Amino acid sequence: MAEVIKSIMRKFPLGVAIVTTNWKGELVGMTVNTFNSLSLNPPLVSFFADRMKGNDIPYKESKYFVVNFTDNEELFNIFALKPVKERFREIKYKEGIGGCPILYDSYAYIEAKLYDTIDVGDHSIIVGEVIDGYQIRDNFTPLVYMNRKYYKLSS
Amino acid sequence: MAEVIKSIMRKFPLGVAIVTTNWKGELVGMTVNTFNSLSLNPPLVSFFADRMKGNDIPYKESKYFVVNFTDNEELFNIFALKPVKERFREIKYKEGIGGCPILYDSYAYIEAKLYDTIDVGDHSIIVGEVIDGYQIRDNFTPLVYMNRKYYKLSS
Ligand SMILES: NC(=O)c1ccc[n+]([C@@H]2O[C@H](COP(=O)([O-])OP(=O)(O)OC[C@H]3O[C@@H](n4cnc5c(N)ncnc54)[C@H](O)[C@@H]3O)[C@@H](O)[C@H]2O)c1
Ligand SMILES: NC(=O)c1ccc[n+]([C@@H]2O[C@H](COP(=O)([O-])OP(=O)(O)OC[C@H]3O[C@@H](n4cnc5c(N)ncnc54)[C@H](O)[C@@H]3O)[C@@H](O)[C@H]2O)c1
Ligand SMILES: Cc1cc2nc3c(=O)[nH]c(=O)nc-3n(C[C@H](O)[C@H](O)[C@H](O)COP(=O)(O)O)c2cc1C
Ligand SMILES: Cc1cc2nc3c(=O)[nH]c(=O)nc-3n(C[C@H](O)[C@H](O)[C@H](O)COP(=O)(O)O)c2cc1C
Secondary structure, eight states: OHHHHHHHHTTSOEEOEEEEEEETTEEEEEEESOOEEEETTTTEEEEEEEGGGTTTHHHHTOSEEEEEEEOOHHHHHHHHHSOGGGGGGSSOEEEOGGGOEEETTEEEEEEEEEEEEEEETTEEEEEEEEEEEEEOOSOOOOOEEETTEEEOBOO | OHHHHHHHHTTSOEEOEEEEEEETTEEEEEEESOOEEEETTTTEEEEEEEGGGTTTHHHHTOSEEEEEEEOOHHHHHHHHHSOGGGGGGSSOEEEOGGGOEEETTEEEEEEEEEEEEEEETTEEEEEEEEEEEEEOOSOOOOOEEETTEEEOBOO
16 A cells, blocks of 8 residues: 555655754755644744654754755755765755754745654655744746756746 | 745645545535655655645544545645635545545545644644545646646756
C-alpha cells in the first residue's frame, strides 16, 4: 500500500515550501510538499515531518519555525538533496524569530511558534501558530511539485 | 492573523481532491485542498475538515471515506459551491467500500478506513488508512488550485 500511495501521489500536484528552524544553534531546514493552513482561529499552519529520517526532531526541540515561500527551484533542490551541513553555506539568509533562518530568495514567509506536535504513523504533524507573515516580493512565479518536477502554472 | 494566512495561501498552489463518504446512508462529499499522504507504514492519508461548518462530522461518524481524483473543474465547483442535497443528483457515481461514493469522472481514487481524527484549532485532521487504490484512467490533466482558480501545469 506504500506503493499505491506513492504512485497516486506522484501525479498529485502540491505547492512546496522550505521550513526552517534554529535547532539549538544549528540552522536546519527542508523542502516540504505537506505545508498547509490548518486553522484560522487560532491561526495555525502545519506540515508533516518524516520520523523515519528524524525530520521531526528539530521542530519538536525548537520553540519556533519559519515557512519560506520561494520560486527558486535551485533552493528546493538544495533543501531536498544536499547534506544538512552544506545547505546554509550556499544561500543568502538572515535570522528571524528564535534565530530561525529566513531565506533571502523567499517572496513571502511565515514566522510560527510551535503549537503542537502529533505523531501519526511514521510522521509527526508539526503545528505552528502564525505569529507574523510577510509578503516581501509581489512579483513571483509559484511552483508546484509533481512527478519529481517543479512546474509553473499554465497562464 | 487569519487574514495573513488567507493572503499568503491565496498564492500557494495546491492539488485538489473530492473526499466522499456514506454518512448513515446520506451521500456526502467536499472539495478539499488539504488532502495529502501522511504515512507510509502504516499507509495513511489525511485531509483537514473545517469544524466551523461541521465538515468533520460525517467522517467522524463513518467507518470509511473515498478520495476522488478528477480533472473536471465542474465537479470541484459542485463539491465546493452547491447545496449538499443537490450534489449527487448532478453527477454519475457508484458505491464503494462502506457505500462511499466513487465519482465516475475520477481518473483515480483511494478507499480508506477511518484511522483517527484529531481536533486542532478550528479543524479536525481526518486520517484514513489506505485499504485500496485504483488508477482508472492513464490520460488526465491534473489541476492545481490557486487564487480561486483551477490551473493546469505548464508543459
Ligand atoms: N515525508 C513526506 O511527506 C515526503 C513527501 C515528498 C517526498 N519525500 C521524500 O523525498 C523522496 C523523493 O520524493 P519523490 O517525489 O521522488 O518521491 P516518490 O517518487 O518516492 O513518491 C512520490 C510521492 O509520494 C509521496 N511520498 C513519498 N514518500 C513519502 C513518505 N515517506 N511519506 C509520505 N508520503 C510520501 C510524496 O507526496 C511524494 O512526492 C521521497 O521518496 C521521500 O523519501 C517525503
Ligand atoms: N478549511 C479549509 O482548509 C479550506 C481551504 C480552502 C477553502 N476553504 C473554504 O472555501 C472558501 C473559498 O475558498 P477561497 O480559495 O476563495 O478562500 P479564501 O480567499 O478565503 O482563502 C484563500 C486560502 O486560504 C486558506 N483558507 C481559507 N479559509 C480557510 C479556513 N477556514 N481554514 C484553513 N485555511 C483556510 C485556503 O488555503 C484558501 O484557499 C474559503 O473562504 C473557506 O471557507 C476552506
Ligand atoms: C518536493 C519534496 C517534498 C518533500 N516533502 C517532505 C515533507 O513534507 N516532509 C518530510 O519529512 N520530508 C519531505 N521531503 C524530504 C525532505 O526534504 C528531506 O528528508 C530533508 O531535506 C532532510 O534531508 P535528508 O534526510 O537527506 O538529510 C520532501 C522532498 C522533496 C523532494
Ligand atoms: C478549492 C477549495 C478547497 C477547499 N478545501 C477544504 C478543505 O480542505 N477542508 C474543508 O473543510 N473545506 C474545504 N473547502 C470548503 C468545502 O468544500 C465546503 O465547506 C464543503 O463543500 C461543504 O460545503 P457547505 O458548507 O457550503 O455546504 C474548500 C473549498 C474550495 C473552493
